[PDB]
Design an enzyme around this catalytic site. Sequence first.
Site, PDB file in Angstrom:
ATOM      1  N   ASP A 193       1.100  -0.627  -0.288  1.00  0.00           N
ATOM      2  CA  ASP A 193      -0.454   0.007   0.502  1.00  0.00           C
ATOM      3  C   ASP A 193       0.448   1.428   0.127  1.00  0.00           C
ATOM      4  O   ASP A 193       1.485   2.042   1.324  1.00  0.00           O
ATOM      5  CB  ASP A 193      -1.207   0.049   1.225  1.00  0.00           C
ATOM      6  N   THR A 194       0.600   1.684  -0.888  1.00  0.00           N
ATOM      7  CA  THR A 194       1.726   3.110  -1.412  1.00  0.00           C
ATOM      8  C   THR A 194       1.027   4.150  -0.224  1.00  0.00           C
ATOM      9  O   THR A 194       1.803   5.160  -0.650  1.00  0.00           O
ATOM     10  CB  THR A 194       2.405   3.637  -3.269  1.00  0.00           C
ATOM     11  N   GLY A 195       0.046   4.497  -0.094  1.00  0.00           N
ATOM     12  CA  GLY A 195      -0.573   5.309   0.225  1.00  0.00           C
ATOM     13  C   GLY A 195      -0.994   5.212   1.974  1.00  0.00           C
ATOM     14  O   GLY A 195      -1.425   6.285   2.341  1.00  0.00           O
TER      15      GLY A 195
END
Lengths: 99, 99
Positions: B25-27
């Site tokens: 999850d880059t967020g």
Amino acid sequence: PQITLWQRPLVTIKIGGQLKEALLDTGADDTVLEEMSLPGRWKPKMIGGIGGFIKVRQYDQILIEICGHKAIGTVLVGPTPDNIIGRNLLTQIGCTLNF
Amino acid sequence: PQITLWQRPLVTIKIGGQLKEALLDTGADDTVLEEMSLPGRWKPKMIGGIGGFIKVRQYDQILIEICGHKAIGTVLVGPTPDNIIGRNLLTQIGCTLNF
Ligand SMILES: *[C]([C]C([N])=O)[C](C(=O)[N][C]([C][C][C][N]C([N])=[N])C([N])=O)N(*)(*)(*)C(*)(*)(=O(*)*)C(*)(*)([C@](*)(*)C(*)(*)(*)(O(*)*)[C@@](*)([N@](*)(*)C(*)(*)(*)(*)([C](*)*)=O(*)*)C(*)(*)(*)C1(*)(*)[C][C][C][C]C1(*)(*)*)C(*)(*)(*)(*)([C](*)*)[C](*)*
């Protein structure tokens, strides 16, 4: 652009004639922006995040330019803390995860 | 690997004797794993997402093996819907975003 993850991966989008910064989020199935004005009909809807569920409105076939790249899909507008570019639009600009 | 985003970017991790699956999850600034059994002392911490805030317990210096690679970092354990590997561990296994 190859983006490293030391800093939040924020990108400029042009959406409905306005300019915004948005986070690139591979954990987001959808695209969700903070309240704004979009022309068009929308339908009510709710998504689930980590702290619970928000009630958003979807608009479909919204033209969005993500870092100079053009994409067209559904955008959720509601009370997210940040603008989120999810995988429904990340696969249109061709974006992958590499390691 | 090169991970394309048509499907959730889900990966096998080994953490504390246990096998789990987690989303890249880059967020997520942080790594938030489903409530599980971990040795040590931790501190109360609270984080936010879409939906609002959660109270999680924070563990520093835990060894995780993410798609076979090892990294040591803070792991937050609490009421999240899915297991998330976030930017604190993703820069450690060399992960980038490409478009
Ligand atoms: C994550 C968690 C952690 N901690 O890391 C999140 C974050 O990061 N958060 C933060 C906040 C800050 C910001 N603010 C402002 N800017 N103002 C903290 N610190 O807490 N992240 C998030 O949330 C994201 C999203 C995610 O990706 C999710 N998605 C949704 C759609 O919701 C993921 C998911 C979960 C559930 C399961 C599946 C996956 C954004 C950014 C919000």
